[PDB]
Curated annotation (Swiss-Prot):
It comes from Pyrococcus horikoshii (strain ATCC 700860 / DSM 12428 / JCM 9974 / NBRC 100139 / OT-3). Its EC number is 2.1.1.216. S-adenosyl-L-methionine binds at R26, R51, D68, D110, A111. Keywords: Methyltransferase, RNA-binding, S-adenosyl-L-methionine, Transferase, tRNA processing, tRNA-binding. CDD domains: AdoMet_MTases. It is an enzyme of class 2 (transferase). It catalyses: guanosine(26) in tRNA + 2 S-adenosyl-L-methionine = N(2)-dimethylguanosine(26) in tRNA + 2 S-adenosyl-L-homocysteine + 2 H(+). Residues 2-365 form the Trm1 methyltransferase domain. This is tRNA (guanine(26)-N(2))-dimethyltransferase. Pfam families: TRM.
Length: 367
């Protein structure tokens, strides 16, 4: 058992999974929570308990629940919590509670069972499982308040990026698109499935922030209460058509596609709430984080990134069309000079988000 520190938290790690590379992911949520201020929060699959402990130590959260089905994880969670908080951690039948400035509840159980027990209870639930969050999504949608916030992470990008299409159909009920656009399509597929599962509870969603980073997909959504809100949310779903010989894409808004070779359904709405993300960059700067440098770099990229469906990958398009292309920086400058919005995107190093029509983009990249 070794001792490590992440952010303001000090924890013991061996078993029980801990990935320091995920400290950035936790920094992001910590930043977000300092803006949204949810009172009652849940770290659904805690492992070492690092996420919930940081929520308690670094955000306005008042009641923090930590849960894990593993006995080893549960034992370690209790130890780590007491390593960061004083008081009496009262335990009884797989549940230990500390009632200090902040109330900490450590639970030993299947996340689905815990969330089923806490119906419409949490202001924020963070689902961060090993791989797919789909076996826990429906219950989380019932456990969060009707105007709650849901944080979802998908680690296995094989199905979301199109490598494992059959698995994507089974888990996400959507047809994935492989290639240069997969990081974004996978991200929109994730948002889209959350929106679809939420509708039956007469709930809609507003995307707070959704992004891709080092082979993992992240989506933060705000639940909207109302059948009509559910209807308007489903109206933001759509499909993508992609020409393999040109890199040109087409969008079709609608619950169902009307032409062959459609990809989706995917969320065609915003992937970020401009205001909040702008605030996040500022909040991140004024906060001591575990990976501050990386956090600011990602948040600034997303903050300045044009929020529009898809993008054009200069490299991939060059290979598809069999043409030579100019550099990304040069292309963006050229597009802006022609009066179009154009920015880089965190989804790909050679991708350019732009309001410009495909043909205008091609004429501009032609070297």
């Amino acid at each position: 058992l070794i001792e490590v520190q992440e952010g303001k938290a000090k924890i013991l790690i061996p078993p029980v999974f801990y990935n320091p590379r995920m400290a950035l992911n936790r920094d992001i949520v910590v930043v977000l929570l300092n803006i949204l201020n949810p009172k009652i929060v849940l770290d659904a699959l805690s492992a070492t308990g690092i996420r919930g402990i940081r929520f308690a130590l670094e955000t306005p959260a008042e009641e923090v629940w930590l849960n894990d089905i593993s006995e080893d994880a549960y034992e370690l969670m209790k130890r780590n919590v007491m390593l960061n908080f004083d008081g009496e951690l009262r335990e009884s039948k797989g549940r230990a509670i500390l009632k200090g400035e902040k109330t900490i509840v450590i639970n030993h159980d299947d996340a689905n069972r815990l969330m089923a027990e806490r119906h419409r209870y949490f202001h924020f639930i963070d689902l961060d499982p090993f791989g797919s969050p789909m076996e826990f999504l429906d219950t989380a949608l019932r456990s969060a308040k009707r105007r709650g916030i849901l944080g979802v992470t998908a680690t296995d990008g094989a199905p979301l990026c199109g490598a494992h299409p059959r698995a994507c159909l089974r888990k996400y009920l959507a047809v994935p698109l492989r290639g240069e656009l997969c990081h974004e399509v996978g991200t929109r597929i994730l948002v889209g499935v959350i929106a679809r599962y939420a509708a039956k509870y007469d709930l809609g969603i507003d995307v707070i922030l959704a992004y891709y980073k080092d082979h993992y997909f992240r989506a933060f959504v705000k639940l909207k209460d109302g059948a009509r809100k559910g209807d308007e949310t489903l109206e933001k779903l759509g499909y993508i058509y992609f020409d393999d010989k040109t890199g040109k894409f087409e969008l079709e808004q609608g619950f169902l596609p009307t032409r062959p070779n459609a990809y989706g359904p995917v969320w065609l709405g915003p992937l970020k709430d401009e205001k909040i993300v702008s605030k996040m960059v500022k909040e991140a700067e004024s906060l001591s984080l575990a990976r501050k440098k990386q956090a600011l770099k990602l948040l600034k990229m997303i903050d300045q990134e044009l929020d529009i469906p898809l993008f054009y990958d200069t490299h991939a398009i060059g290979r598809r069309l069999k043409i030579e292309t100019k550099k990304v920086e040069e292309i963006i400058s050229a597009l802006r000079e022609q009066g179009y919005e154009a920015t880089r995107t965190h989804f790909s190093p050679t991708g350019i988000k732009t309001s410009a029509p495909y043909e205008v983009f091609i004429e501009t990249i032609k070297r």
